[PDB]
């Protein structure tokens, strides 16, 4: 579990959105794996807007941050999870790393800020879904 808190915004996981998300919904992408709701508290996260290749993600099920280097977000095959089925996923970035479907949500973040969150795992990568593109998170 996890989310990114920028201005009035809270960034999800797609598959773990809850009825308040959809019922707040301001934008979803189901090859993406995000989903954006409306909050009434301002957030503490800042979005990096930069194109980074190093930072730290945050891996629940080991209680411990990494380090890790990533690839630039791409359009990418994924295994199937318990969560999704084998598919094509957008705006995706690898790094070797242990990923469990519970560590979705985790922060990954380099000297600018939040880059993305841990939306993939599995035979030693972690994948996280890319945020910096998404230029209206930090702007009205
Ligand atoms: C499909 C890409 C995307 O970012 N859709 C959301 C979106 N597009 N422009 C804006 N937003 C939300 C707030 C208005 C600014
Ligand atoms: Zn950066």
Redesign the pocket.
């Known amino acids: 579990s996890g989310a990114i808190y920028v201005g009035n915004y809270r960034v999800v996981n797609r598959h773990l959105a809850t009825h308040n998300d959809w019922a707040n919904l301001?934008?979803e992408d189901s090859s993406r794996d995000l989903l954006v709701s409306s909050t009434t508290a301002q957030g503490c996260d800042t979005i990096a807007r930069c194109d980074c290749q190093t930072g730290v993600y945050y891996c629940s099920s080991r209680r411990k941050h990494y380090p890790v280097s990533f690839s630039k977000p791409s359009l990418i095959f994924v295994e199937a999870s318990e969560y999704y089925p084998a598919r094509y996923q957008s705006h995706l970035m690898l790094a070797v790393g242990h990923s469990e479907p519970g560590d979705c949500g985790g922060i990954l973040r380099c000297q600018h800020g939040v880059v993305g969150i841990v939306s993939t795992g599995g035979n030693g990568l972690v994948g996280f879904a890319d945020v910096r593109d998404?230029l209206?998170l930090d702007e009205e």
Do not use: A, G, P, Y
Request: charged share 0%; hydrophobic share 100%.
């Open positions: 301001v934008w998404l209206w």
